[PDB]
Design an enzyme around this catalytic site. Structure first.
Site, PDB file in Angstrom:
ATOM      1  CE1 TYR A  77       6.665 -10.492  -1.940  1.00  8.94           C
ATOM      2  CE2 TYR A  77       7.382 -12.532  -1.418  1.00  8.94           C
ATOM      3  CZ  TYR A  77       6.355 -11.494  -1.754  1.00  8.94           C
ATOM      4  OH  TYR A  77       4.838 -11.814  -1.992  1.00  8.94           O
ATOM      5  CG  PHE A  99       5.501 -19.975  -2.480  1.00  5.83           C
ATOM      6  CD1 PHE A  99       6.832 -19.891  -2.123  1.00  5.83           C
ATOM      7  CD2 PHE A  99       4.220 -19.210  -1.982  1.00  5.83           C
ATOM      8  CE1 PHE A  99       6.849 -18.772  -0.880  1.00  5.83           C
ATOM      9  CE2 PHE A  99       4.497 -18.444  -0.926  1.00  5.83           C
ATOM     10  CZ  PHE A  99       5.776 -18.437  -0.379  1.00  5.83           C
ATOM     11  CG  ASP A 100       5.052 -14.714  -3.282  1.00  2.51           C
ATOM     12  OD1 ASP A 100       4.924 -13.920  -4.398  1.00  2.51           O
ATOM     13  OD2 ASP A 100       4.735 -14.361  -2.354  1.00  2.51           O
ATOM     14  CB  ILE A 154       5.119 -13.602   7.975  1.00  2.02           C
ATOM     15  CG1 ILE A 154       5.185 -14.727   8.867  1.00  2.02           C
ATOM     16  CG2 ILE A 154       6.197 -13.577   6.800  1.00  2.02           C
ATOM     17  CD1 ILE A 154       3.834 -15.187   9.569  1.00  2.02           C
ATOM     18  CE1 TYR A 182       1.083 -16.118   6.559  1.00  2.00           C
ATOM     19  CE2 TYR A 182       2.153 -17.452   4.741  1.00  2.00           C
ATOM     20  CZ  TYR A 182       1.810 -16.419   5.285  1.00  2.00           C
ATOM     21  OH  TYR A 182       1.697 -15.108   4.475  1.00  2.00           O
ATOM     22  CG  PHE A 201      11.403 -15.057   1.990  1.00  3.97           C
ATOM     23  CD1 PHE A 201      11.152 -16.092   3.145  1.00  3.97           C
ATOM     24  CD2 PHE A 201      10.435 -14.405   1.326  1.00  3.97           C
ATOM     25  CE1 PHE A 201       9.785 -16.294   3.424  1.00  3.97           C
ATOM     26  CE2 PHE A 201       9.132 -14.782   1.735  1.00  3.97           C
ATOM     27  CZ  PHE A 201       8.735 -15.890   2.712  1.00  3.97           C
TER      28      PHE A 201
END
Lengths: 88, 903, 107
Positions: C26, C36-37, C56, C82, C99
């Site tokens: 992902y 960020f990821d 999540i 979140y 995503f």
């Protein structure tokens, strides 16, 4: 103008040596430049040709080192890169 | 607040040299269709997703320099407003992706077909995937410049260009009226695949620094002759109106007599037995007197050009005769030369140039007429479609046709010369084709400032492959990227295009080189000397001096610098490998000199003056311009007043000035659905922010533009107006028309101040200062303007997440020009809260020290990467088209400035 | 409560149900485009067990929706992310998530 009548900078006897200099220094190996630099100093000390020649006889080992001077490494690689340079 | 870093792949663009555009009286067609095939695509060769986009781009601002740039690096097609792309799922323009529906929509996979259509008659770019239409059409995009196919791709892709005809088969029937892009190829050149304008190319001996490239223009496809109507025909011309016509009535017929095209009495011209050498009386009367007045028309062109006649010597009529040669003998009414005969006569070079431009003005009138009958250019001739391979202006025509046109009129001017009448050259006026972009002419190259030398004897070679404009020598590390070398004290450079050495002026030195020459620059900081050598020969000054410069202070240092003009290719050899140098042994080796980078494992990083304008703050010691920051008073808000220092004095710098504030404002991510005291809750819940600019008395609002710019606006115009503002609208609908999404994009949201003044007869210099304010609503993306407290009809609307910089563009006309007023209005929050999150609840206007006015210098320094992508471009086949291959991955670490949205 | 969009078709017939581990590469991103990821920076596929709510719920439901071997795009609102609490020092409170999900394999 400044030196039309006569001038040291336009003297042909020294000028021909200036032109002929690369060939003259072409023979000498730059590892011997330590002997070359000390040669002017002993010339300035009023030492004649025969006694500086035996000074070179006494100081045959005083050449430079190619490893400690990286500037000499490529110079010497091109020096033996010249086809006219024999190791003897 | 803090810079972000990421690892980003290298993205390059490959284009075919097929340029299309439209203008008044254009020789090109307005519909074009081309395709791209996908052979192999690796999804994730590295961490970053593989980049692959196809589409069109514009020749006047699309320069995707490798490495970092606007947005998040890897810039290609669609990253700005100068290109239009389609990655397979979105339409790319202005660095914004907008999803599009396709029957089986997916990112471009191996073995897929994309049908790209461009209409120049009306702005529309349609896209199809494997023949299935994609409901996206670009609308309202400028037609200026030229359009071309282009592919932007990262590593790991193999794509094929299908251009139709001999250059592809399209594997799908093209839409009607869309001529394949393979038919736009010029005759003087051959079709090839090349990247966009570059500063480096591989060379067999070594990498070549590539100077700026001369670019073709749309204005170069309109044939613009000199008008030959308002010319009263002179007596000396009507006196010779006949012989100069008689000699061009069958001059085209003379060549082919006594061949397979030999005349016969039964037929006439154009019947594969054309000549009819007898006379033009036998020939039809309309074309006959047409040929007479075409001879007159050529003489009228001579008049309009500046040719006048004078008679001196013996009349050629006496000493001329007609020669009944054994060749060209005919049975129809005797035999004679088909034109009027002429004896030994010669022509000087003035006549050669004059007949050249005379043929030019014949060709450009013919092309103009054909265009006025609708015709256009096509490399393959199509008579029923009314297209010709010779409908291009003479300057773009081929040498065969140039010679064929020039031969006839050369004979004509020769016959004129025989009668002794002078062919007078006109006056000479020197003209330059392109003048505005003085900076897209030379691309300075210099090493990194770390390698700056303070001593020793340094030598390096620059191979002058061509004989054009190149400058090589040494310069201090503070060389300004937008100042010519040697024009200031910060350079000691030599130009061997005219034997010239540049340092704070001009003075003759040496001789110019030729193609392939190698210039070896000598330098001795210890002896304070600079010398230049050419092909192992020491260059000589205009005296006994053999050194270019003498008595040079060591200073902060010097750096080996070379530059290249338009259409120049030159190799720089700093001498990392001493054997690479050719003339070092000849000169320099025995003198103790050393190569600049002789003992350096990695090649020295070079920097080039990037020709891409970037907003940067004004230097405090600017001689001409100044920005005044005064503390906010109880009655007036803080302001940023711009004052021209040397306005009204001698030799002042006057030019169009671009200004912007150093910080942007970002709209809300989601748009909302569907005395003189502020309201405390409205002032806290408002989403519209106001600023203003006070155009002082003496400054003409007719040369003031006030508004906003997005950070990607990188256009520098000396004669800027709202017509050149980049704009495009993405139009979307369902599968059967029904356009339901029309979003407009622009890099500049700005209103002209000349429409905000009282339309009086005189008194344009307003005694009262014009205060124009701009308001932005973040909750809706709405931009509105106020003229003098009253709203104007101008307004704008944009998508969320967009960043707009406060920008005022003005050509100065006074000592006091403009003044950015950071004020406010009733129930309207000032920009002090819009810029800073920490001050979002502060109604009082404030001007913190970070916010400062920036101005746009066109040229800034840049770094080229130590490695470049390896692309294989070749013609895989006639049906296979042209194949582009690139597989080796390359990644760079990009430092992204957040607020300026650039890395 | 999430929106998905396929990017590159894969199987299109098999769905990830309970009993087999879900393996993805992902790439999460912020609402403004600030990455960020990801997993390919770590050069290792991310394996997570469907069912025990360790990840999540927006990601869980999106992975459940999309089929096997099919590169997808997800979109998680703060109501399924979140949200107000936010990931400490990484994701700002009440942020929309995007995503670049690639469900490469199951087990």
């Amino acid at each position: 103008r400044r030196g039309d009548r006569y001038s040291v900078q336009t003297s042909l006897i020294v000028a021909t040596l200036k032109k002929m200099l690369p060939i003259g220094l072409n023979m000498c190996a730059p590892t011997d430049q330590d002997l070359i630099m000390l040669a002017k100093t002993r010339y300035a000390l009023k030492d004649t040709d025969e006694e500086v020649r035996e000074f070179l006889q006494n100081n045959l080992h005083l050449q430079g080192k190619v490893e400690g001077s990286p500037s000499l490494r490529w110079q010497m690689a091109l020096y033996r890169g010249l086809p006219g340079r024999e190791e003897d | 607040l803090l810079l972000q870093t990421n690892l980003i792949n290298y993205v390059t663009s490959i284009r075919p040299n097929i340029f299309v555009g439209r203008a008044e009286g254009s020789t090109q067609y307005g519909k074009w269709y081309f395709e791209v095939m996908v052979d192999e695509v690796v999804p994730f060769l590295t961490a970053q997703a593989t980049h692959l986009r196809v589409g069109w781009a514009l020749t006047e601002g699309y320069s995707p320099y490798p490495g970092g740039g606007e947005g998040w690096g890897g810039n290609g097609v669609g990253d700005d407003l100068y290109s239009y792309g389609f990655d397979g799922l979105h339409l790319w323009t202005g660095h914004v992706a907008r999803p599009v529906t396709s029957p089986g929509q997916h990112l471009l996979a191996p073995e897929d077909v994309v049908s790209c259509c461009l209409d120049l008659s009306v702005p529309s770019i349609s896209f199809r995937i494997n023949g299935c239409p994609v409901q996206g059409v670009f609308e309202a995009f400028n037609l200026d410049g030229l359009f071309f196919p282009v592919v932007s791709f990262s590593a790991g892709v193999k794509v094929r260009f299908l251009l139709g005809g001999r250059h592809g088969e399209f594997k799908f029937l093209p839409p009607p009226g869309y001529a394949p892009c393979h038919e736009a190829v010029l005759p003087r050149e051959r079709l090839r695949l090349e990247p966009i304008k570059e500063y480096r190319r591989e060379g067999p001996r070594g990498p070549h620094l590539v100077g700026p490239s001369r670019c073709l223009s749309h204005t170069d496809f309109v044939p613009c002759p000199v008008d030959t109507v308002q010319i009263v025909l002179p007596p000396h011309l009507e006196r010779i109106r006949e012989k100069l016509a008689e000699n061009i009535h069958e001059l085209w017929a003379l060549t082919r007599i006594e061949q397979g095209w030999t005349y016969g009495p039964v037929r006439d011209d154009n019947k594969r037995l054309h000549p009819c050498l007898v006379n033009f009386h036998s020939l039809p009367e309309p074309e006959r007197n047409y040929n007479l007045q075409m001879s007159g028309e050529t003489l009228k062109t001579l008049l309009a050009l500046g040719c006048h006649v004078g008679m001196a010597d013996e009349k050629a009529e006496d000493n001329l005769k007609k020669t009944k040669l054994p060749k060209t003998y005919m049975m129809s009414n005797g035999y004679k030369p088909a034109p009027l005969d002429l004896s030994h006569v010669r022509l000087t070079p003035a006549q050669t140039t004059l007949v050249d431009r005379l043929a030019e003005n014949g060709h450009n009138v013919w092309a103009r007429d054909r265009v006025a009958q609708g015709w256009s250019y096509s490399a393959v001739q199509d008579i029923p479609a009314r297209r010709n391979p010779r409908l291009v202006p003479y300057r773009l025509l081929d040498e065969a046709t140039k010679r064929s046109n020039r031969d006839s009129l050369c004979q004509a001017v020769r016959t004129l010369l025989g009668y002794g009448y002078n062919i007078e050259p006109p006056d000479q006026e020197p003209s330059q084709v392109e003048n505005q972009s003085r900076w897209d002419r030379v691309r300075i190259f210099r090493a990194e400032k770390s390698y700056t030398v303070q001593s020793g004897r340094w030598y390096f070679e620059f191979e002058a492959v061509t004989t054009g404009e190149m400058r090589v020598g040494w310069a201090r590390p503070e060389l300004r990227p937008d100042v010519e070398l040697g024009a200031d004290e910060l350079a000691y450079v030599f130009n061997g295009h005219r034997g010239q050495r540049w340092h704070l002026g001009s003075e003759p030195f040496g001789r110019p080189w030729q193609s392939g020459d190698v210039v070896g620059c000598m330098i001795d900081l210890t002896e304070n000397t600079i010398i230049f050598t050419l092909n192992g020969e020491v260059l000589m000054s205009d005296s006994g001096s053999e050194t270019a410069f003498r008595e040079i202070e060591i200073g902060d240092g010097f750096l080996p610098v070379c530059s290249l003009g338009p259409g120049q290719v030159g190799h720089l050899n700093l001498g990392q490998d001493v054997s690479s140098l050719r003339f070092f042994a000849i000169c320099g080796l025995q003198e103790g000199f050393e190569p600049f980078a002789i003992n350096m494992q990695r090649p020295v990083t070079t920097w080039f003056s990037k020709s891409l304008p970037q907003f940067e703050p004004v230097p405090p010691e600017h001689p001409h311009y100044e920005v005044a920051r005064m503390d906010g008073t109880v009655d007036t808000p803080p302001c940023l007043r711009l004052a021209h220092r040397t306005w009204g004095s001698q030799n002042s710098l006057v030019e169009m000035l671009f200004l912007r504030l150093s910080l942007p404002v970002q709209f809300h991510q989601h748009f909302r659905c569907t005395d003189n005291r502020d309201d405390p809750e409205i002032i806290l819940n408002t989403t519209t922010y106001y600023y203003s600019v006070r155009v002082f008395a003496g400054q003409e609002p007719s040369c003031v533009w006030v508004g906003w710019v997005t950070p990607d606006y990188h256009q520098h115009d000396m004669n800027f107006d709202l017509s050149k503002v980049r704009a495009v609208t993405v139009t979307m609908g369902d599968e059967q028309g029904n356009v339901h999404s029309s979003l407009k994009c622009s890099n500049c949201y700005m209103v002209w101040g000349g429409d905000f003044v009282s339309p009086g007869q005189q008194g344009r210099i307003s005694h009262t200062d014009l205060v124009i304010g701009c308001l932005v609503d973040l909750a809706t993306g709405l931009m509105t303007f106020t003229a003098n407290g009253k709203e104007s009809n101008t307004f704008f609307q944009v998508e969320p997440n967009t960043k707009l910089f406060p920008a005022v563009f003005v050509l100065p006309t006074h000592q006091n020009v403009i003044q950015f007023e950071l004020g406010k209005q009733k129930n309207i929050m000032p920009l002090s809260a819009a810029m800073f999150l920490s001050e979002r609840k502060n109604p009082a206007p404030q001007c913190p020290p970070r916010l400062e006015v920036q101005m746009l210098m066109p040229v800034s320094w840049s770094r080229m990467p130590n490695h470049f992508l390896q692309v294989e471009t070749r013609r895989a086949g006639e049906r296979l088209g042209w194949a582009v291959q690139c597989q080796d991955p390359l990644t760079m670490m990009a430092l992204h400035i957040p607020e300026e949205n650039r890395c | 409560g999430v929106e998905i969009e396929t990017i590159s078709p894969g199987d299109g017939r098999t769905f990830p149900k309970k009993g087999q581990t879900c393996v993805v590469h992902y790439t999460g991103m912020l609402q403004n485009g600030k990455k960020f990821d990801s997993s390919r920076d770590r050069n290792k596929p991310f394996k997570f067990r469907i069912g025990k709510q360790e990840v999540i719920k927006g990601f869980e439901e999106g992975a459940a929706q999309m089929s096997l071997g099919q590169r997808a795009k997800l979109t998680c609102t703060p109501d399924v992310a979140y949200g107000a609490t936010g990931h400490p020092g990484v994701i700002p409170p009440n942020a929309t998530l995007i995503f670049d999900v690639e469900l490469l394999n199951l087990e």
